Each structure stands twice: as C-alpha cells, then as structure tokens.
Design a protein around this ligand. Structure first.
Ligand SMILES: Cc1ccc(/C=N/NC(=S)N[C@@H]2O[C@H](CO)[C@@H](O)[C@H](O)[C@H]2O)cc1
Ligand SMILES: Cc1ccc(/C=N/NC(=S)N[C@@H]2O[C@H](CO)[C@@H](O)[C@H](O)[C@H]2O)cc1
Ligand SMILES: Cc1ccc(/C=N/NC(=S)N[C@@H]2O[C@H](CO)[C@@H](O)[C@H](O)[C@H]2O)cc1
Ligand SMILES: Cc1ccc(/C=N/NC(=S)N[C@@H]2O[C@H](CO)[C@@H](O)[C@H](O)[C@H]2O)cc1
Lengths: 811, 811
C-alpha cells in the first residue's frame, strides 16, 4: 500500500504464503478449519523469523572472523514490546507479508495485536536499552544485550472502581517464537558460601549453585542484514539440588528458579530485597563468564579492554566490577593493580536518576551472607580509592566520608553508584542538564577527583519503532518529499524546514494526525467502550506514575478548566481530550491515590451535561510499549511537566516530538535540548528553571502562600478536601491535599499559575490549525538529534572506542 | 541394512536429508560447524515428526466424521520411554533415516541415545498404559490416553558407595519435540470451597481454581497411518492468583503449579499425601470436561455410554466416578438414578495389585477439605450401594461393613477400590490367576453381589517396541522364515514351531542372542567401565525393588553359587553373569538395603581371584525403559520369582520370553499362562503354588525351620550376620537377616531349596547350547498370546463394545 513498507514482489508474496501454510501445518499442527487467530499469528511469526536465521548465523560468524571489539550492554531491563512488526520493518517485509496475509484472507494488523509485549522493563531505562539495541544493530556494532529472562514482566494494570489492580504478566504462556534456548551455554552461578584464604590466595567455597541458561533473541538492524543478539538468562536448579523428603526436594527447586521469575516493578523506592540482589548478581556472573569465554575463544588480559566494553545500565549490574575483579584476581591470578586497570578500562557506567530514594545502597550484612568474596573485594576497592582521595585532597576528612563506597550509619551500606564511578573509565548522564547536575551536585566530589570520567550522552529513541512502525502515514508523507534515507539518518528531517510554508505538506501533516486521532478514537470505543471527540485537542501524559512527573499538576489544570467551564458554561473553549496513563509501582501509595484521583476527576467531568464533549478525562489503562505506539501518533500535546531537575532525560518526550505533537514542559531533562533544537518559540515552556527551584529550597517552600494568593487553586483544594470528587467517601483524597499543602517535594503549586497560563497559549494556538501545524512541522524537522543512532554513535566514539558502520552485510 | 526396518528409497533419503538440513538451519539455528550432537538429534526428531502431522490431523478429522465410540484411558502413569525410534518403526522410516543420516555423516544410533526417556511412570502399570496406547493405535481404535505431564518423571538412580541416590529427572530441560501445547483447550479445575444446598440442588462454591493446560503427544499405529493422541495436563496458575506482597503473590503461583511437578515414586506404600490427591483430581476433572466437550461437539446423556468408554487404570483416577456424577447431577441436572446408570455403563476399572498396603484408602478429612462435594456424592453412592447389599443378603451385617466404601476406624477412610467396583460395569484383573484371586479373596463379597462385572484381561506387551525396535536381529531372522505379518499378529509366531529342528534357524537364533550379548557387554564397558564374560549365562532380574519380587531370593542363590565355588574351586561350573537392576521407592528402607546387599555381594564376588570370570554380579544402575530395550535382548535367563499370589501379572516376563530368554519362575501372575502356552517342560518352574502359600500361612511360617534344616542357607545367614559382605560395618545387614528370620511376609526361605535345585537344571541345560536354543525357540514361538494387541482386542470386545480394525487410513 505505502512505499516505506517495502516491495510486495510476486516471488516474495508467493513464498511467504507457502511458508505460512507450511508453518500452520507442520509447526502449529493445524489446518484452516481448526486454526485460531493465535495460530495465524504464530504461523506468521514463524514465517518472518525464518528470514532472520541466515542473517543471524552469518552476523555472528562475521564477528568471529573479523574479531571486532565487543559491546556488552548489561541491563536488568529490556522493554522490547512486540517483535513481529519491528522485524518486518527492519527486513523490508511489511508490505509483502501484508499482501501475503491479505491473499490468505487475513488482516495482518489483527494478527499483530495478538503478540504479547515483551514487558521486561518498567519505563524509560528499560525502553532505552531496547532502542539502544536497535541502534547498535543498525549501526553495525558487535553488540550484545545481556539481561534476565523474567517469567513475569511488568504487571498488567487493571483499573477496578478507579483503583489500580495488578495481575501477573504471563507473557510466555503460549511460548515465545522469538527466542532460541541455548542449553549448551548453561553456566553455574554461585551464592552464599565462605571465603578461605590459602597460600594461593582467597577461595570462595561451600557455595550454592544456580544454573544460568541463556535464551537468544535476534536484534535486526535496519535493512543492513545485521542481526545482533540479546541474551537473557533463566535460572535453573542443578539436578542434585536439595538431594516426602524426596517430593519436597523436587518442589524446592522452585526456590533456585525464583531468581528469574519476576521483574521488580518498584521504580520509585530502592528496596534492599535479597531476591533483587540475587537477580543482579545472577545476570552479572553468568554474563561475565560468557564474555570471558568468548574473549578466550579468539592468558593475555592486557587486551581485554581492547576487545571488550561493558556498559552498566545504572547501578543494577554494578556487581560486574567486583565480579570482574574476582575472576581476574582469584581465578586468573592477575595481580590486583593489573586486574583493576583492566576492570576500569572495560567498564562504563550510565546514571539514570538523581532521586536519592532510587539509589542502590545495599546493606553490608546482605552482601556478607550472599556474596562474601565480593564484599571483601569492595572493601579493598574502597580502601585503595580512599587512599587516592586522601592523597589528592590532604586533610579533607569530610570528603573521605562523603566519597566512601561504604556508608556508616545504623545499617552499614554499600553505595553502588560510588562503586560504579570508582570502577569505570566513564560515567555519563543522559541529558546535558542531568550530566551537569551530576558534576555540580551528587557526584561533585568524584568529578573534582577525576573530571575526565564525566560525560554526557543525551538519550534518544529509535526512529524505526517510534516513527516508521507506529506512524507509517507520517513516515510516508515525509519520504514523499525527502526520500527514505532519514530513517537511519534522522538529521535529514531538517530538510522539512523548507516545507514549513508548503500548503500541500501542511495539509498532509494535519491529515496524518487526524487519521491517527480517528484510529485511536476507534481503538478506545472498540476495546474499552469509551466515546471521545476526535476534533478535540489530544492532551496526553503517559509515563509511570510518580510524584516528580507531576501528573498531579496536570490534574489541577484539568479541574481548573472544568471549574471555568462550570463558571461560564456558554463561553467557547477549545475542546480537549485529556488522557493520562501509566502504571504505579504496587507499593507506592501516593501514586495509586493519584490514579484514583484521575479516574475520580473523569467520573465527575465525563458525566457533567453542561460540559458536553468540550472536556473529557480518560485514564489510559495498562500503558505499555504497544499502547504507546498507538497513543503517541494520535497526540497533539505532550505533557512533560516534571519539576525542573528531577527527570534525568525523559524519552517519551522525544517520541511525541517525532510524531507531531507539540510539547508543554518545564526546562527539565532533554526538554531543554528539545526546545533548543526546535527554538523556544515552537515549544510551550513554563515554570521554574533548576535555579528557581534551588532558590525556593533555600528560602523554604511554603505551599500555603500559593493557596492564599491564588483563588482558583484554593477552590480546587477545597473541592478535593470537601469530597466534591468523592461524594460517598468525602475524605478519600486527604492524603493528596495534605501532601500538597505540607510536604510536597516537587512544588506542584509553585508552577501552577505559569502552567495554566501556558496551557491557555496552547488552546490559543490550536484555534489556528494552520499555525499549529507549522509549529508541529518545525518540531518534527528538528527532532533529528534525538535519534538513538546519534546517542549510540556518541557512546561508540567517546566511550567504547569503536566506529559505527552503516554498510550492509551481504544477503 | 535389514528388511523389517523398511525401504530406503532414493526419493525418501534425499527428502529426509534436505528436511534434516532445513531443521538444523531454521529450527535449531545452527550450521554444521557449530552443531552439537544434541542438535543433530533434534534435527532428526523434527524431520521425523514432520511425517506424523498429516496423519495425526486426518486421524482426528476421521474420528470427527465417523463419530466412533471413544476410548478414554485414564492413567497417572504413562511410561513411554523414547519416541524417535518407535515413530520411525511405526512409519517404516527407520532404514531411510539410517541411510539419510549415514550420508550426512552421522550415526543414527548415537543420535537415538541422546533422547531422554519420557519416564512418566514407575514400572509395570505405567509401561502397560504405554503398550496399550500403541496397541490401540495399531488396532485402529479411537483412543486417547489422558494423564499428567509431570515436569519430573521417575528419578534417575545413581549408585554411590553401593547405595541408591535419587536425582531429579529433568526430562523437559532441552524441550520435548514430541509434544504440542494446546492452550486453547485450557480448562479450570476446582479445589477446596464448600457446598451450598439451594432449591436448585447443591452448588460447589468459593473454590480455588487451577488451570489445566493440555499437551498432545502423537501415538502412531503400526504402519496403518493412524495417529492417536496422548493428552497430558499441566497445571497453570490463573493470572489473578494470589492477587513485597506483589512479588510473593507472583512467586506463590508455584503452589498451584506444583500439582504437575513430580511423579510420586512410592509404588510400594500408599501415602495419603494431599498433593497426590490433587494430582488424581486434577487429571480427572480436566479429562472429564474434555470428554464431555468432545461428546457435545457431535442434552441427551443416554447415548453417553454408547459414545464414551473410560478405563480407570487402577484406583488412581477413581475420582472419575463421583466427578462424572457431580457434572451429571449438579451441572447437567440429570436425576441421580439416570446419572448413575450413565456412570456405571461408562466406567470400567482395572486392578493391578492385591498387596493391601498399596490400596488407596483416602482419609475422609482430606476429601472433606479438598473435595467437599465429591465426599457427599461418595457417601450417597455408598448408602444406595449398601441398600442393594442389604436387600440381596438380608441380615448379613458383617458383609455390610466389609463392602462399605467408608471404612470406620481411627481415621475414617474411603476405600477407592470399593468405589471403582460399585461405579463400574466391569472390573478386571491382569492375569488369569490374579483375576481368580480377586473373585476368591479380596473382592469376593463384590463378586457374589455382581458376578457379571468380573473379568480377566491378561496383560500384554507391544511387539513393536519389545521386538522390532529393541531386537531387529531377532525380528529379521523370524521375518526371513515367516514374513512380516506377525508384527501386528503375534500369534503367527507359532509357525516357528516347525523350525524347532531346523539347523539353520537354531544357528541363527543362537547367533542373534550372541550378538545381543556382545553388544550389551560392550555397552557395559563403554558407559560404566565394567568387564564381563559374554560367554557366560546372562542371568537377569530387572524390575522395581520390592520384597515380594524377591530380589533377595536371587541374592541367596548368588551367594550359594559363590560358596560352592569357594568350597570346590577346581570343579567346573557354568559361568554366569548375574545382573539385578531396578529402582527402589525413595522411602522404602528395606528395598534400599536390598540394593546395598546386591552391590556388597558384587564387591566380594567380582574381586575374588578364585572365582575368576565364572561368577559376576552386577547391579544395573538406573533401570528404565531404554535400558530394558538393551538388556532384555541380551538376556538368557529371566528371573520371575515373586512369591506365588503376589505379582498380579508381570510384563517384564513377557518381554524376556519374546526376546529369547528362558524363564525361571514361580506359578505367579502371567508366568502361569506363559508356562501353559510354552508347555511346562520349556519353563523352569519352581516353588510354592498359591495353595502351598495358603497352607503355610494357616500353620504359620517359621523361617527358623528352614535355617535349621538347610546347612547352605545357615552358612549364608551367618555370613550376612557376621559381616562377611560388610567387613568395615559388620552389622550392616542385620535388618535383612532379622526380617528374613522373623518377619518375612514373602517366605524367601520356603522357596530356597527348590529355587537352587531348579537353577542347577538351568545350568545343566545351558551346557547343551543346541537344546537350550530349541527350548528358546519353543518359548518365542508360543509368546504370541502376550501381545498387547490381543489384550486390547479383548478389552475392546468384552468391555468397551468396539471392534478393532487392522485397515489402513489413506496416506
Ligand atoms: C529469530 C529466531 C529464529 C529461529 C528460532 C528457532 N527456534 N527454535 C526453537 S526449538 N525455539 C524454541 O521454541 C519454543 C517456542 O515454543 C520456546 O519455548 C523455546 O524457548 C525455544 O528455544 C528462534 C528465533
Ligand atoms: C526495581 C527498579 C529500580 C530502579 C529503577 C530505575 N528506573 N529508572 C528509570 S526508568 N530512569 C529513567 O531512565 C530514563 C533513561 O535514561 C530517563 O529518560 C528517565 O528520565 C529516568 O527517570 C527501575 C526499577
Ligand atoms: C508429532 C508432532 C508434530 C508437530 C509438533 C509441533 N509442535 N510445535 C510446537 S510450537 N511445539 C512446541 O515446541 C516446544 C519444543 O521446544 C515445546 O516446548 C512446546 O511445549 C510445544 O508445544 C509436535 C509434535
Ligand atoms: C504412587 C504409586 C502408587 C501405586 C502404584 C502402583 N503400581 N502398581 C503397579 S506397577 N502394578 C503392576 O501393574 C502391572 C500391570 O498390570 C502388573 O504386571 C504388575 O504385576 C503390578 O505389580 C504406583 C505408584
């Protein structure tokens, strides 16, 4: 149908159809009379995956022959979403499969909806890993993602009576067509035990052994025939494990296999839970053995850093540092200083937050029991590091206690971030302002000691998933004017600037959005039975529920608009559909209250006859990658409204910019760079800058001051307190009111006036469709910087020491 | 190479080779440079299984079109063993695959050794189910095996320091190429809850739900293009299950899934363990819903028994009876009497033992908690049944308490065997003598009430696995003389009687055995590092370790031969290799001692220089179906020496007879029929008959009497007591001696003299190879009756009311 989706040649269509029927018969053991829709999806998935195998085998063979430096991306999260369409896109098979399935009498889009998301991540950090893998494959890097194959990914969110309910994401139930178990590469991982010191150095003995079994998933590059590997470890009990008593022993195998059972969803508050530590060590131990095995299959560890880069995705795999030391020192018998040199040059650390409650600080007593040798190595790293600090800053005793990897206190803890900085040759934040905040505040001491380690690598998103796949209409009208090269060279979108006054292009951009909004309005009626006005402004905030992300500020605005309507019902207002979506971490009480507030607001607003269809508030249930692919192209306004200094980068922001939504946001995270690229005139910037927040903290934030001086804010609070939004439970929202009035870390009230005013300027612009669209064009045209291809090229050159290559491997 | 293994046509070999390379590439994601031996096995398994699919789909389609009466074989055990060779045999693909793999540079036999046994059974009852499935497919019956897909089958046995060690049989670790998950047929199974009585009858409410997910495994008939289904249920938690607390809730899903985790290996002693009851109900509930679903997809349950037979393989699925009643009464609203009529006519029960400690007698309090509605139905069945007994035998109050399904006592129990008899139109034992023992003793009261219910169906073994597959040499020399028809018509083996004096045939039979013995002697050196004389008599006893099976009696004989040698070292004795193998139930202390005794005897005997290679005692580790396929063809003497009245049938006995071993045995179980078929002159029968045992029990068995009157027996006991076989632990075997002397239920000493004497007659015959072989020929020629095809044809005609058919389905 559309050009960017590839050729539907006669020979290819015929072959796809025959292979589809082959798989239906031989793989699914079905014929057309008994086939379920799920069978059809699997026949298609198997048909498509067949095209990956030659490329996958030869990509890996290529790396063995050429022996390039290998990139190991260690993450506990890979938020992959669905794989079928992505694979077709990157293989140029989409139109062909569409045709082939059409001739077979099937709707491919309906088949695509059957695939479960690989929801092996929580939010931004997990999706970043996924975008990165895609960019690394597209840029021809010898890169491997390493993580855990969770049996249960992020929970499915259900909303019952306005409340979030979690249910197990049993994503593997029907089997995953995209993975290949690799049992011959099964590796033992050790836990507990004790350290014996001999003449021949330390020995870690009496350990419990869990097996790590790898599963390989293909990561296809964009039309370059490169297929990289994502290797996820699953926990398996050894067969002599725990071996009435016989039965129990077999049942207790579950204990060892619990390690890979479930993704921790608490992206808000670090919990020192032992199972989480086991998961962190599990992925690190298995991965490092696999890395070293591959390194040897080419004595001399001097060349290790020339052949290996390990990227630590936050501190979650920080145990890579003492684990590498452990292997190098205890098993390979390198001296400490040489092992350390190798380690530092091998590892790099990416920080993804400044919220102190999110920092990993593992209780010493836990490491003592679980990983006794690692604790010893950590103490040793700390001593030698603190000797360096003492020498560089003689007499600065407070610097010593601030920089220590060991924090003294009630429970002694290890600061994993301090471990990562000490053990890495590079440390980067994920947006310019965030990287600066690291240098100036939380890692200031470390920056003063080793300024050369600190870098910025502004986040990006893959334009394959986040444009071509989810927004083919927009990709097509762009390709019509500038060709297809921009898909793997997003900077080329700048060429669209000379179309800002092009009437046809303005008409096309606005029509694509309208079509996207219509399709999403339909999706909402079909799957959720809710009726929205597609001519309204689509005002969307989708992201995990956090106080810092200030879904609450959006709530206050919603209520203001509602109250203004109720005050002057016969005044014209630009109609809005306000959509808020996102999961709350199950133990985050405030976030669950916020969700309930949102639904409670919807309950009042969506049923007020006076409101009509001028204002609708919808909570988007079960926000996840596949839902983002639908809602983002349909959005007009992107809410990026975190308190300045709190969102390290954001990536949702970039997805919206790429897909033709205007952004209302604070100068926070990557918003700053987005506004700089587009020009501030084409952005709706409001609120305190970082400096204003700091000034406020010095004086002391008094929420009452705002409540006393803003009558519209007072009314809202009074309505919240008195039970206007919870008639049967008048005090339901007292926690929220209390927090807002007395202990708001994120200064919701401080930005309220400016936000509302800025929101009026949004409504004003939307009244003028032509000028709205010209501003949109100016955003899309400048979103090039935010391609993860750019981010990855920067990592490759500035951190990993490898050159990207856009060259095809032979097909 | 050999004719019975099929044609190796040019077109087939070429196609097998190309499909093998296709699977290696596309399915295993490998090329020849990186392929492991396990990859080669899987490529072959996938290549072969491709040939099953058309036949499987059309067999099932056929049943839907023709709508024949369906046979449901309910078992908690299906001891399938390996599937690859069996499939090739039944599809006539063996020579072709052998050729194809040979040209690819692979040894197919080496590939076959990689396949794990499906060890979903303990011993005879589980193997019976497997042979039966094979015969039902071969006889063109619309038959389904239903059971549980255990994650862990029978434990792998390791022998450490002469002691049995169990390890988990993780048979699914690499994936099972022979199964197809059928998630669309997932069914809920209910546990716990309570019964509400309404106006509209009883209601079972507030239950916990476990999901039952079916996996289908093909059961190919012998060259008739029929492929039946074995459907095994796996336990899955529902997604709202149990839904810090979030993490635990996800982890607790294991509790529900524990149901299908592991096969209970306690074939010796009924344990009223709740998990076992859950497994029994699980397979019954899921199966019955599946049966009823299939019945409806053709209101009128009158025709249910015309369309459905359910065979209960022992009492383990006895809950089928009250479950059928429950569905019919509570869910379909049939009146009791009509539901009962339907139930009785639908169900038949096969008893597999008379050992009272093996009978299922479930504590009432367990049924109360787990299955409250079923208990109520059982009480109701009992009342109406006992009303029938009272009416037929007025005043016989003791009959009433003996026949009750409820046993009063300390804990009230339900006698599941009594439930099965009451709820079934037919009850059968598994050998003529066993069926008679049921009528005369343990079910006498029931036989007097309903004599028409009691039948015999003498056990059988499939000649496909147990001749063609494991003994191709013997199958071939037989086919050379009489053609190939006997493979699915084993009675034709009688034709071999006219070859008893045929010199060429005598030479061939003896040569096949010699080749088999050589191959097995090699197998023992290669995989276990033990060196045996292939010219010795192969004296084998392989079967689960039980006191009743009297491995101990064999032990006494072994020691007698050893002592006689030591007494007169320079006298000629026919050399023997004595092989004993079998697993002990992990909690069966005596059985574990017996294994230790056997190894301890081996330790002494195998290292006595005076003995030489005249006597060797070897414990065959990890006896299982795939090992039986090796050892049985190599055996000369089959030890079938259970105390008369204790082995219901035996089937190992039939395997040995078919494969050219002579049998030393008691008149017990099917031995009686084997001796009758072959003629007693061609059998080594010894020991007490059933009547002699009964006489002994009346007087009282005094083991001392034998110890006092048999000096050779005294010496053995003294040696056992004094530490001759355990020098470092002199009292190690005091339990055995004590049991033998004071509490031997199985009268080991009573048969000792006759056994030893009979064993001399065996040695005498073996001295004359020509006459040994002529007797062997006379056994093989009369083993026809013991084909499970005969057994199944009897079930079909006399119990299920269906005609077998040897006709091909179109290919
Ligand atoms: C891209 C690509 C290409 C080929 C393959 C081949 N895959 N080949 C096998 S046999 N895949 C297996 O299939 C099962 C699916 O039910 C999984 O449960 C199992 O984990 C997986 O290893 C996998 C991925
Ligand atoms: C269990 C657990 C513990 C901690 C976490 C942390 N999760 N941390 C995230 S999702 N960090 C996010 O990373 C993105 C990518 O750089 C940024 O754009 C975004 O600003 C930042 O908040 C998640 C789960
Ligand atoms: C005889 C026959 C013919 C075709 C098939 C087709 N089978 N097709 C699939 S996708 N089989 C799956 O394969 C996985 C193996 O790794 C299993 O883990 C899984 O349980 C099984 O359902 C199965 C049996
Ligand atoms: C957990 C558990 C509980 C009970 C059992 C019972 N297992 N019961 C067996 S294996 N019964 C056997 O059945 C064969 C087939 O008819 C007969 O030839 C044989 O004589 C008989 O002993 C097995 C496991």
């Amino acid at each position: 149908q559309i050009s960017v989706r590839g050729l539907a040649g006669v020979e290819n269509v015929t072959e796809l159809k025959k292979n589809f029927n082959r798989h239906l018969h031989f793989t699914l053991v079905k014929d057309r009379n008994v086939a379920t829709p799920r069978d059809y999806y699997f026949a298609l998935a198997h048909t498509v995956r067949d095209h990956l195998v030659g490329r996958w085998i030869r990509t890996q063979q290529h790396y063995y022959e050429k022996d390039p430096k290998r990139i190991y991306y260690l993450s506990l999260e890979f938020y992959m979403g669905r794989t079928l369409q992505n694979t077709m896109v990157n293989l140029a098979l989409e139109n062909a499969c569409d045709e082939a399935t059409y001739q077979l009498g099937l709707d491919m889009e309906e088949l695509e909806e059957i695939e479960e998301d690989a929801g092996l991540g929580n939010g931004g950090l997990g999706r970043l890993a996924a975008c990165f893998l895609d960019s690394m494959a597209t840029l021809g890097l010898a890169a491997y993602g390493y993580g855990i194959r969770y049996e249960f990914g992020i929970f499915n969110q259900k909303i019952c009576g306005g409340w979030q309910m979690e249910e197990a994401d049993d994503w593997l139930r029907y089997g995953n067509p995209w993975e290949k178990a690799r049992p011959e590469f099964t590796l033992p991982v050790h836990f507990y035990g004790r350290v014996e010191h001999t003449s021949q150095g330390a020995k870690w003995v009496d350990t419990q052994v869990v097996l790590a079994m790898p599963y390989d998933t293909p990561v296809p590059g964009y039309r370059n025939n490169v297929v990289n590997t994502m290797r996820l470890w699953s926990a398996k009990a050894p067969n002599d494990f725990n071996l009435g008593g016989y039965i129990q022993a077999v049942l207790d195998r579950n204990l060892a296999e619990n390690i890979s059972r479930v993704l921790y969803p608490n992206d808000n508050f670090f919990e020192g839970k032992e199972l989480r530590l086991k998961q962190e060590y599990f992925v690190v131990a298995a991965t490092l053995q696999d890395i070293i095995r591959r390194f040897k299959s080419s004595t001399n560890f001097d060349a290790f850093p020339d052949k290996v880069a390990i990227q630590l995705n936050d501190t979650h795999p920080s145990l890579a540092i003492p684990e590498l030391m452990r292997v190098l020192v205890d098993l390979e018998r390198l001296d400490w200083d040489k092992a350390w040199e190798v380690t530092v040059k091998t590892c790099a650390y990416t920080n993804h937050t400044v919220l102190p409650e999110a920092l990993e600080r593992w209780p010493v007593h836990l490491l003592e029991t679980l990983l006794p040798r690692h604790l010893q190595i950590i103490y040793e790293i700390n001593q030698r590091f603190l000797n360096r600090v003492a020498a560089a800053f003689p007499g600065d005793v407070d610097r010593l206690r601030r920089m220590s990897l060991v924090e003294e206190g009630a429970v002694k803890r290890i600061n994993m971030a301090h471990l990562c900085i000490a053990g890495s040759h590079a440390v980067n934040g994920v947006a310019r302002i965030h990287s600066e905040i690291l240098k100036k505040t939380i890692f200031k001491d470390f920056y003063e000691l080793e300024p050369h380690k600190f870098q910025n690598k502004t986040n990006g998103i893959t334009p394959r998933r986040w444009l071509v796949l989810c927004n083919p209409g927009l990709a097509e009208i762009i390709a019509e004017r500038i060709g297809e090269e921009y898909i793997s060279d997003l900077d080329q979108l700048r060429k669209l600037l000379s179309y800002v006054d092009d009437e046809a292009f303005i008409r096309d951009v606005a029509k694509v959005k309208q079509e996207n909004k219509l399709k999403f309005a339909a999706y909402l009626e079909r799957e959720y039975k809710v009726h929205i006005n597609p001519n309204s402004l689509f005002d969307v905030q989708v992201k995990r529920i956090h106080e810092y992300k200030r879904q609450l500020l959006n709530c206050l605005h919603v209520i203001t608009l509602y109250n203004r309507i109720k005050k002057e019902p016969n005044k014209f207002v630009v109609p809005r559909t306000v959509m808020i979506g996102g999961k709350a971490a199950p133990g985050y009480h405030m976030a669950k209250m916020i969700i309930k507030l949102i639904t409670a607001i919807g309950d009042v607003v969506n049923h007020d006859p006076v409101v009509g269809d001028r204002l609708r508030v919808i909570f988007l249930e079960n926000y996840r990658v596949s839902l983002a692919e639908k809602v983002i192209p349909a959005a007009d306004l992107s809410e990026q409204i975190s308190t300045a200094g709190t969102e390290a980068s954001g990536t949702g922001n970039m997805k919206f910019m790429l897909n033709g939504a205007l952004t209302i946001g604070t100068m926070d995270g990557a918003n700053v760079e987005m506004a700089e690229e587009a020009g501030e005139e084409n952005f709706f910037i409001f609120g305190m800058r970082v400096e204003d927040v700091d000034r406020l903290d010095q004086r002391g934030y008094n929420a009452q001051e705002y409540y006393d001086r803003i009558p519209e804010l007072r009314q809202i609070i009074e309505q919240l307190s008195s039970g206007f939004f919870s008639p049967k439970q008048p005090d339901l929202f007292k926690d929220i009111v209390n927090m807002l009035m007395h202990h708001d870390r994120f200064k919701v009230f401080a930005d309220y006036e400016e936000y509302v005013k800025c929101q009026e300027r949004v409504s004003a612009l939307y009244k003028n469709p032509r000028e709205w669209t010209r501003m949109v064009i100016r955003n899309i045209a400048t979103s090039g910087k935010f391609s993860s291809d750019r981010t990855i090229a920067q990592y490759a050159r500035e951190i990993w020491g490898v050159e990207p290559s856009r060259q095809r491997l032979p097909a």
